[PDB]
Design a binder for this molecule. Structure first.
Ligand SMILES: NC(=O)C1=CN([C@@H]2O[C@H](COP(=O)(O)OP(=O)(O)OC[C@H]3O[C@@H](n4cnc5c(N)ncnc54)[C@H](O)[C@@H]3O)[C@@H](O)[C@H]2O)C=CC1
Ligand SMILES: NC(=O)C1=CN([C@@H]2O[C@H](COP(=O)(O)OP(=O)(O)OC[C@H]3O[C@@H](n4cnc5c(N)ncnc54)[C@H](O)[C@@H]3O)[C@@H](O)[C@H]2O)C=CC1
Ligand SMILES: O=CNC1CCCCC1
Ligand SMILES: O=CNC1CCCCC1
Ligand SMILES: [Zn+2]
Ligand SMILES: [Zn+2]
Ligand SMILES: [Zn+2]
Ligand SMILES: [Zn+2]
Lengths: 374, 374
């Protein structure tokens, strides 16, 4: 009943920074060639979405944010071959065009068609499918999931198992996959190893999940909020430390705890100081540190390159290093096959209309992931 | 005739920074338990030794520097089992104790007994074997090869082929192995890849050799001194670029030349800016950059962590990542079997007494490696 026609629906619009989201009616255009229009079913609140509100992350405003989600295809544009109406899907914030150098590389996932490096906030063709009170509204990472309906490019969507629990697997859209893959794929955590994880939110908990799956012997969680320790230990942490409890810098503490430094470290917060600290706490000759957290826009860190000269490996990744379109369906299948759990990450479930409350929860430290249901 | 007796010989003493070395008589004590006294045959002039003079590399003064060398064992102390008098040997600036956690790790090489991290300028026991004008003189990285005789700890010396040409294989003690290993072992350059090498001195040329051995398709040499291009090409560079020849930053140039960034980049100079430039020029999603150059003492670099977040891997290494005592004999055997060449690095030969002229040659940009003969 809506194919080919503009849909008027409810979405959460962010008109400017540091304001609450505005719940109102937007118009969503029909998909054009190689485009897919999706009816949202569930969406998670990730810290990345909050970064747009706080100014940590810069992307054109006004925008319909949201990128961790799942839904059902309402309609497809001409030339689409990978999904069909009625299919359960997950929008991919990192696309997989399959044609670029990165997509063709065995170890690359940061497809050149991404909207991250040089944020435009549109569709692949340079325009937007969203309007609110007569104004054009920007897209976010080619996803825009805080809406009852969205339109995405074909390369930014994956078809998933028809029997999937959308209220759970939306987390495969960002948080879980990012953390899990950062450990198992990017760091390539080894059996018997010692790991340190900075940040115990949804993404950090997922990193822990990965470290445990990889066979780590010790997994030290680090967070200034002690309230996040019980959940970390439930999912695999062997020890948790709060930097504020110590008189000395935490890198020193961790080095002592690990009898000379950890094998693998992970920055899952988004702070410059913690990125340097995490590098420092890994063993000087063979240690590996992975940056996951997003830094505040345009800001540079300062470090001594002797930390690397001795032998350390420092790397970062988007979406856990997973080639998005290939991996997402695979991950959903693994979850259906009980290979990992998602429930430990879900602390709150709210209706979409309560998005602001959901963000309040995140900002207060009370939640891990709030799932919004449409 | 000299066993168990103090040896009086000539050495090049550095009394203070930024002055010429003083060639004069020193007193070399006999080796203590697990110590080896070596009659030096040949030693190379590496930039790192110049860094001691310039204050770029901080180690206690007065000192007998020099660390890329080869000689013959004069005597051994009690308990030495790995070398015997008359053996040809190469001193190891990076030790291999074989007992620490790093030595036991499959990838690690920066043995915890090293004198680089917290320089003491002594033997393993905290004392010196050198006296000059009645004053104790410091050791350098446990080697001190700018002397007719030196004393080194057993874990800092390797026995090599009795037939080795010491005037050539002394380079396996530093320069060649560092560069070669940085490409083949640390970066693990792949067949068909595009590489960029910043710095075309002895070490950078060795990096090029390694890249070529590894099968790289393109090897782009970068240096502000064009006079260093011909030899770079000889050893394998496919292209050479002088950053001063351009209006753009060389990272932009290199990115354009490589159609999106290089596979592998190497910083083989020792500047904070080029370490960042080198990182920036490798592919944002799958690129790898290796720091080999030594940065000015206690200086911090500035960089945007988004360079890592996209997928880059940044790492550094000492001595090309080679476990020193295991690797050095092998490298010599390979050299003997013509697996790599050393002659392209040797531009000048001088007698030890002309150490200062050798340093002048390095500083003037005229030489690659000057080999000093005793
Ligand atoms: N690389 C990627 O592809 C992705 C990056 N991210 C980034 O990962 C980070 C984490 O995301 P979420 O788990 O959703 O965030 P979150 O806010 O739920 O978790 C962050 C945790 O860090 C802790 N923390 C804050 N300051 C700290 C400090 N100084 N020391 C120690 N702990 C501290 C907080 O208490 C909190 O538990 C964010 O920066 C997010 O933007 C998110 C997903 C994708
Ligand atoms: N990591 C390790 O184990 C080792 C590190 N090193 C370090 O490696 C570096 C290279 O050593 P060598 O080859 O002996 O030195 P070198 O001085 O012969 O070569 C350095 C080259 O860099 C070039 N250069 C200088 N400034 C430049 C700029 N702005 N842009 C481009 N090129 C520039 C010079 O013209 C020169 O050709 C030194 O810093 C040295 O201390 C050396 C040995 C072992
Ligand atoms: O959280 C989802 N995506 C993130 C990935 C890292 C850069 C900011 C956006
Ligand atoms: O050049 C030989 N050794 C170097 C290794 C890197 C730190 C300074 C000393
Ligand atoms: Zn692509
Ligand atoms: Zn996210
Ligand atoms: Zn050791
Ligand atoms: Zn050297």
């Amino acid at each position: 009943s809506t194919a080919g026609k503009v849909i008027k629906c409810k979405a959460a619009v962010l008109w400017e920074e540091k304001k609450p989201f505005s719940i109102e009616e937007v118009e969503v255009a029909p998909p054009k060639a190689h485009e897919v229009r999706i009816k949202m079913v569930a969406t998670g609140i990730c810290r990345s979405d909050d970064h747009v509100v706080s100014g940590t992350l810069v992307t054109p405003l006004p925008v319909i944010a949201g990128h961790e989600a799942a839904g059902i295809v309402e309609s497809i544009g001409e030339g689409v071959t990978t999904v069909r109406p009625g299919d359960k899907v997950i929008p991919l914030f990192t696309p997989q065009c399959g044609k670029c150098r990165v997509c063709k590389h065995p170890e690359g996932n940061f497809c050149l068609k991404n909207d991250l490096s040089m944020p435009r906030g549109t569709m692949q063709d340079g325009t937007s499918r969203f309007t609110c009170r007569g104004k054009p509204i920007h897209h976010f990472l080619g996803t825009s999931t805080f809406s009852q309906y969205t339109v995405v490019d074909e390369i930014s969507v994956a078809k998933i198992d028809a029997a999937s629990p959308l209220e759970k697997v939306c987390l495969i859209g960002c948080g879980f996959s990012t953390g899990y893959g950062s450990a198992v794929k990017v760091a390539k955590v080894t059996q018997g190893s010692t790991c340190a994880v900075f940040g115990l939110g949804g993404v950090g908990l997922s990193v822990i999940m990965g470290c445990k799956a990889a066979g780590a012997a010790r997994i030290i969680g680090v967070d200034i909020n002690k309230d996040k320790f019980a959940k970390a230990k439930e999912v695999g942490a062997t020890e948790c430390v709060n930097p504020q409890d110590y008189k000395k810098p935490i890198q020193e503490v961790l080095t002592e705890m690990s009898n000379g430094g950890v094998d693998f470290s992970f920055e899952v917060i988004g702070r410059l100081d913690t990125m340097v600290t995490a590098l420092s706490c890994c063993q000087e000759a063979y240690g590996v540190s992975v940056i996951v957290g997003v830094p505040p826009d345009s800001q540079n860190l300062s470090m001594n390159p002797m930390l690397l000269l001795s032998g350390r490996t420092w790397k970062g990744a988007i979406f856990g290093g997973f080639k998005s379109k290939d991996s997402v369906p695979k991950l959903v299948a693994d979850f259906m096959a009980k290979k990992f759990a998602l429930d430990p990450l879900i602390t709150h479930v709210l209706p979409f209309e309560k998005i602001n409350e959901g963000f309040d929860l995140l900002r207060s430290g009370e939640s891990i992931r709030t799932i919004l249901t449409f």
